[PDB]
């Protein structure tokens, strides 16, 4: 359950929090992706990488030597925590989107976070953030030691993770 | 065949702004239609009891009886009797509680120690600890607040008071608030209202932004 | 009369560097011919109890037995049984001693918080607090060493472990060392030592003095 | 045929947390049916020994016998006798090993020298060295923990203890840990833990970080 992801603040800190809004990163990396007009959403910048990535003293991937089964469990836990934190972020009505009985726009946010995770494992990210690049490279290394086939196999389980969180 | 009379801890008075008398029985043989009453020094019945528990399956009764009394009456320190009417006992079993006398009041000192710099480096979580020292009696109620709004009791916990190593007659309580490192590295207040009898106004608070330790006269910055 | 179990704790075995099994028979009358022996399931164990506690103010003994067992044997999870044979007991009774099982181990994160600025300004004392957070199971031993030398147990007091605010299974404990502002201003590094099962080395040490917080690159000093 | 039983080195004591022994032997007749055994002056039951080495083709057969011994018993220095019987030699190979006594315990001084700037300037490696000097018992066990997680013995190489040049009784040792200069610049606080008998808790830490050792380059003296 506990993974080291804090409550979402991408569109503003939760009340009583006031500031902390994350702006759209309309920039591209020369080394990775070269020219890309896509702008990274605040939510994606705040994606709950979970145990896949620790920010201690810069950025260091936590899956340097992780088995395929372990990586699947880590991603499942990360998606579950992302769903939980997104629900508590939109339920309090702090997300700009959120200002059935689910919080308005929560399903959009969780589906889009799942899409971002899919593209993180697949390695086809439109724009690579700080956490995106190293995680993409390491996940490519782990599986190929073909990534698309792996995710096309475990997507049902990963989405079952979101359903179980809900 | 005794009765456990729980006095209202000062946290209880401060939380609900009323003095609540709760006496819990124990080690009483099983039978129905058992009644309890609360009586003060003069013996007059104070208030009928509510939220009475059903017969205890564990063979030892634990019935909760609530009686309301004037705050000043409890502050004076009279002996309030909880009379338990039990069929087996020829006379009702009586237990009484009075607040301790003496207990030289000493104002608490509320110092907030912000998170260690080596904890913020983890960039995961931080624990703002609101140290409270040099107070008596051993009853405080530390409550946290962010930006002036109360925080849910899930986020903070208060260690039980313990004797202070230096002063024998004083105690110290130690409370922490688990804050997210982003919310700390961004300027946030996280006050700490400390409720105690020895305080003049019965509550004091100290805040810790990220900028408390900052010099406030030279915003010295390092940039590549 | 009743036999009670006192398993050794990490606070005990680490301090004494030996696993001391203790038996307890609470409030037994002052009689003669106290016999205590220790046995595992196989039963070949034979240890002799020494220095039985003297009569307490209640005028009734409390049987206490001292036994020496290898750390590996205790860590094996084998249940330890202590024989009790005494005149007051109508028949000998055996008490069962074993450690809790099925609990995960998480290494603590010893964060050493220097005393608050407000407290040093009083020029009365400083309480360097050792925050031992995120650990499990709830059994931690905190030692305070100054300039590489142990400090007297009187100076510091260690808070009992409490459940962590947010993390479900983890705990947190605090140890405060009270020292004069002059000593703190001089700087002796006041190392905090934590002993816990989950630590890879079984011990971790942290250090703090007046110079830890001050920035290293720039020495901006305001003068009049 | 004489068995060269080896005492459990302190590195074995602290790395495995258990006292494991062996009875390596110089042998004349390559193979015999009977296996190793261990005896004590107390004459307690021998421990189980398994996984004996296969016949050595060059006739210098060496056999290993594993036994579990209490740390306190080995700490006391009581002699343990390896008893090995073979068909060729009816007389048991009675040889005794005990930890040497009479040697004063001297606390190691651990000094973590950062990498030479001549090395970081290459931006290819950063060999952090844990200089352990001044410990009188030859035994020592240096372990490296990076960013709070212990590192495998592959990464670092610990030099064998050697006599100190100046002080004859004392010894010294080295333990270099090599990490790519990318990791060093992040400031990961590479910590060295030395395990030695003389230490107050048998382990002391010294942490080196990219910032440590950097003097105050800028000394701004704002005076009004
Ligand atoms: C200087 O002031 C700004 C206010 O916008 C603050 O964000 C910054 O942290 C200050 N400098 C340092 C070194 O803290
Ligand atoms: C850092 O500044 C303080 C402020 O007066 C001064 O006392 C100290 O000497 C300075 N450090 C060094 C290394 O000079
Ligand atoms: C730093 O500046 C202060 C300003 O008075 C001075 O006293 C001190 O000697 C200086 N230290 C160094 C190392 O230059």
UniProtKB/Swiss-Prot annotation, chains B, C, D:
Residues 103-212 are annotated as: CH4. It comes from the Eukaryota. N-glycosylated; important for IgM secretion and its localization at the plasma membrane. The interaction with FCMR is glycan-independent. Disulfide bonds join 23-82, 130-192. Changing residue 149 to A: Has no effect on IgM BCR assembly. Glycans are attached at residues 51, 58. Signal peptide: none annotated. Constant region of immunoglobulin heavy chains. Immunoglobulins, also known as antibodies, are membrane-bound or secreted glycoproteins produced by B lymphocytes. In the recognition phase of humoral immunity, the membrane-bound immunoglobulins serve as receptors which, upon binding of a specific antigen, trigger the clonal expansion and differentiation of B lymphocytes into immunoglobulins-secreting plasma cells. Secreted immunoglobulins mediate the effector phase of humoral immunity, which results in the elimination of bound antigens. The basic structural unit of both sIgM and mIgM molecules consists of two identical heavy chains and two identical light chains; disulfide-linked. N-terminal variable regions of the heavy and light chains form the antigen binding sites, whereas the C-terminal constant regions of the heavy chains interact with immune receptors to mediate effector functions. It is linked to Agammaglobulinemia 1, autosomal recessive: A primary immunodeficiency characterized by profoundly low or absent serum antibodies and low or absent circulating B cells due to an early block of B-cell development. Affected individuals develop severe infections in the first years of life. This is Immunoglobulin heavy constant mu. It comes from Homo sapiens (Human). The chain holds residues 222 to 433 of 474 of the full protein.
